[PDB]
Amino acid sequence: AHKETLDKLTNAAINKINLLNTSKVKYLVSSAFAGLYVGIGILLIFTIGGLLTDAGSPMTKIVMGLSFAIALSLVIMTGTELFTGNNMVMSAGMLNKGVSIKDTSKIWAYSWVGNLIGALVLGIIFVGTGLVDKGPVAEFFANTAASKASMPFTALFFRGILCNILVCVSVLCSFRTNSDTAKIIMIFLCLFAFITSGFEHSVANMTIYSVSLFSPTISTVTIGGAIYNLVAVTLGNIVGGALFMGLGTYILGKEK
Amino acid sequence: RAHKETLDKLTNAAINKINLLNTSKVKYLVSSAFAGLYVGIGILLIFTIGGLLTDAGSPMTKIVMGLSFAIALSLVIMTGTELFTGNNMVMSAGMLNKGVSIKDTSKIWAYSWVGNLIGALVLGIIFVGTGLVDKGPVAEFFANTAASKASMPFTALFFRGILCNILVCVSVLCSFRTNSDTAKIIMIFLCLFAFITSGFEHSVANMTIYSVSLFSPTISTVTIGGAIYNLVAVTLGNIVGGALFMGLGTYILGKEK
Amino acid sequence: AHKETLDKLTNAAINKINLLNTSKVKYLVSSAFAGLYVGIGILLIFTIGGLLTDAGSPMTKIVMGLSFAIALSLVIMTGTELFTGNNMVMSAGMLNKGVSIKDTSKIWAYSWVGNLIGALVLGIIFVGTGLVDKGPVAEFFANTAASKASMPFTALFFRGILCNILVCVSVLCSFRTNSDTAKIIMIFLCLFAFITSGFEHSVANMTIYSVSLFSPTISTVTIGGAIYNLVAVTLGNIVGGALFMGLGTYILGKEK
Amino acid sequence: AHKETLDKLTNAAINKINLLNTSKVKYLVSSAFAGLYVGIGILLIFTIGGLLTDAGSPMTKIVMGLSFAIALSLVIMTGTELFTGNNMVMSAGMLNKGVSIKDTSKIWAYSWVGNLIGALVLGIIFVGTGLVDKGPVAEFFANTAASKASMPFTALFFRGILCNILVCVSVLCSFRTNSDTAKIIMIFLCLFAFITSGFEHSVANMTIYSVSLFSPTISTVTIGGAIYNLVAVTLGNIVGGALFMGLGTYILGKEK
Amino acid sequence: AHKETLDKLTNAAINKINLLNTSKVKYLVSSAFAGLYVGIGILLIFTIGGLLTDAGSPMTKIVMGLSFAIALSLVIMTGTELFTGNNMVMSAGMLNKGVSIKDTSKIWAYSWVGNLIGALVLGIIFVGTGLVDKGPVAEFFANTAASKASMPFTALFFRGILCNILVCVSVLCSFRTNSDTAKIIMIFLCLFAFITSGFEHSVANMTIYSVSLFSPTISTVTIGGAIYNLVAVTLGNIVGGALFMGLGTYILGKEK
Ligand SMILES: CCCCCCCCO[C@@H]1O[C@H](CO)[C@@H](O)[C@H](O)[C@H]1O
Ligand SMILES: CCCCCCCCO[C@@H]1O[C@H](CO)[C@@H](O)[C@H](O)[C@H]1O
């Protein structure tokens, strides 16, 4: 049912841009929450990364992956604005003559900046719990944040592609089912996949660098490196979202 | 995107609460009691696990603990009973939405809080009578955890409670946005897995923690003035996460003019 | 929604006493099965107890509790007469003016005996499988039946209270959801909670003592010690089922 | 509600026999598929039993049980003819005046033989894969076949009884719910129990022996010993299925 | 309920060829995603194999099977064209007189070549991430591709069969249920069964070899060996898929 799906997608895009043109406050607040949601998932899996790494476990990355489902499940189940997901919706709705190229440009920028705000808000709050004053978890953040800002642009860009392919395909999946359960399971599988395989998610990283740059202990990485990671991964996501999933669902769901 | 339809569902839920309180206090407390005892049953389970595993020196203890805490909020959702931390978002949202007053909110918060506590007290007492926390790893787990929580800076507890309710209320929010019960349970399971393992603080869960520690004859790491210090700051944290975050969010996203 | 549920419970209660006043065969044959169904859960988690204990792992209690779900899941899905569950139904239905004190006591007695007959039959058959001729499993039974029969009264009594709160609250959930899957998930969590936490269920114990008594491989049993545990635990279940859940569901769901 | 189920069963029995009298091809082809489907489950959990026993694991049997769900999940979800299941269905239908005693015997004889053809075909093909040319799995196969063909008749008979009580009770559940998801979860719990507990399924054993015999590695099997196990368990199965489940479902769901 | 299913199947077949006859771009792009989706499943379970292998674990093969569901799940939920699935559909469709032999061979050819386009695309992108420049994963990819290539034709062939009997029987299931969750669960089981059992999947192998050839690590892969495996496995699938499931779902479902 590609036609029915492409239509759903396009409506989604129109609804998004409509919200933005109606209330920037509403759209920013909705995106803020999606960032805090994806971020919560990060906090869970780095807390797991810490516990399991300190204990020298081979299962660390598998378990970290199995436990990330909450990040996207919360976003999908609350109907909040996540930038990575708008990479497919805006483009798919754009090729379908439902939204302009500006519309897409505007939703991407606002959803992005909006997601960042949720991540910064979460960062400060977590930091204030003490839970990263020192120890295995605190360190797991510092090291990870360093690893990522230290990788080749090509490596990130491509990691970013494979990631948003998985994310958007689970979003597409939710558009093609009525089972909120099936929705969640598919999100579970895709995040399990993208997390454990080592792909890069622009928004989830906002929480990673948010907590680092806001933590006292963490001296390891600069703000300039956080921008290099987000930009290289962002571009990667955009490609994997718009140029693969966006264009793909349109091609499969046109009618002449 | 179905925010108006939901903010409505919320604003209605808020009304039914203050309505229930106003027609029968026996009914509102007895409900709040079963909720506290339900959230507490969840603490009995994961603290038993917390004990078996720490005594064995496993690195998976906090992970397995968070995973098993699902029963706490699941019972409360599936029975439709009054939980204080859940009303932080409902009453809050229903208030901003011109459905209930500030007086109603603080009435429901108080009666459900004091109500949940009765649930904990009854549970703890009964749990002690089972003899399961006379001695051993579990007793030691309650004893040690009770002390760690009572001896943390105010700010730490405060923020730990904020992140907790954002998760607890959001799982509730999810339940107002789906007709699948299975979907409801899963999301609760995920949100609880997150807040437990991440090390966040839930006031009504702590009532069973302190209920059991203080009531146990052999567990003295406690201090009632300590349990109060915790329950107050964590509760403050929960209200800020439930009302100022989720409550205010569900409304800002739900209005129309 | 408590009016509908309380009404719903009262109807269940009235059906039970109707079935018993209509056919004692049907009601004992339905109780025997519910006993033998819960008993099956025991045979599983004790076979699991023998293997994990003999090997001495910490997870033993946790795995056992996660595996007991089948016990009450068969009872609910087959729709058969479990004594512990009748503590809430008959209790609430009675308070709601639908059933009489005499009706409650009959349904309580007849399902108890019936459940027991259920376990006796399971025991004999299990004994004949040889699965308990000697080794970890038969040892886990022997060892477990001892401690249960050597615990102070109040301990069992309270343990029985907490058990039937969980067992009945899962039964309650199966009255508040149209999703059969959601039913099974809730039973799962409740049975996981009460098993791993070390609470006492009377019907399940009939199977424990059924095997320990029929198996040649002795025990620190002595029947008299089995009647002591079954009597003290049953009273606990009754209090937890009737006084807590039964009366609780009534108070929340009356109308004036 | 039991006549509404007892009715479903009686209709299921009438349709089974209607199929046999309409196409001995269709009924066999269906039974051979059920047999092969169940065997497929065996191939998985013996591949597991081989991996885990070799490494000396205390979890071996527990993981085996947890993974055997696929066996009956294909037979129920595809609607194919399984002998063990026909014990309760044909039995209950025969007691409810739906089908005759000769009807019950044809269905039983054919489905049984049909299931064997499935196992044989699967057995052959599996051997051709080379996965039993030598090693842990092959050893687990030949080892388990022996132990089974070496146990007293009684043991097998009683194991067969408890095995079918469980396999049939899950088949009953699938008659008592409209949730396909629920149907599966229940099959999962029932097989988990009977596998891990130590009970004997006659059709699953066909594949166990199919492989052991057709397998290039000597044996220690003796085909005359394989028949001993299949007769012992099959009879155990019949009792468990017919006398217990069949008779119980009829008794609980009559109308006078 | 096979008539209705055979009808449903014959319809899928008619739609597939219709799609191909109406737009080669739509069809190939649809097959490109199916291959890439199945490939993502491989990327996941080889990342898992690399980690657990390097840590020397006996559970590795078991954890790989449990984590492969995302492969056929993404495909069934996006409604995309996977060659191994068309072995059954086109077979049953043909025998039921909905499509021709020419129609069949076109669908087979185009999906297979379409799936390969997807493998090659996933390959390039994945290697571009550095996640296989060197290490346990990279070495795992290399090592598995070598084993597969260096295996007798008869072995690969028979494993291709059993693999597709499961891949297809899961597609058959998705045709028989309306529970989307039940569809995923059943796929999860079937992919668990064939991965852990050690069976051979043509399309999954496409990404294995796609990554082993673009990958920097030197090994014993040999292109002539990749074609030898792809061919001998492809065949195996065609047989188990068409000669087994196709013909079976036809025989059980025709009407006279
Ligand atoms: C906290 C306030 C956030 C405001 C974010 C607005 C940033 C807009 O950014 C611009 O928006 C244009 C359309 O308006 C697009 O055409 C441009 O591509 C984009 O850069
Ligand atoms: C047995 C439990 C009794 C609980 C009684 C709680 C009564 C709360 O009463 C409320 O208190 C608020 C302050 O918290 C005030 O702002 C409100 O005006 C007042 O109505």
Ligand SMILES: CCCCCCCCO[C@@H]1O[C@H](CO)[C@@H](O)[C@H](O)[C@H]1O
């Ligand atoms: C073969 C098994 C037969 C069991 C029949 C049990 C009959 C129980 O009968 C009931 O016993 C109660 C107390 O036990 C009494 O309070 C009731 O008055 C009485 O009807």
Ligand SMILES: [Zn+2]
């Ligand atoms: Zn349209």
Ligand SMILES: [Zn+2]
């Ligand atoms: Zn309104």
Ligand SMILES: [Zn+2]
């Ligand atoms: Zn009424």
Ligand SMILES: [Zn+2]
């Ligand atoms: Zn009739």
Ligand SMILES: [Zn+2]
């Ligand atoms: Zn037709």
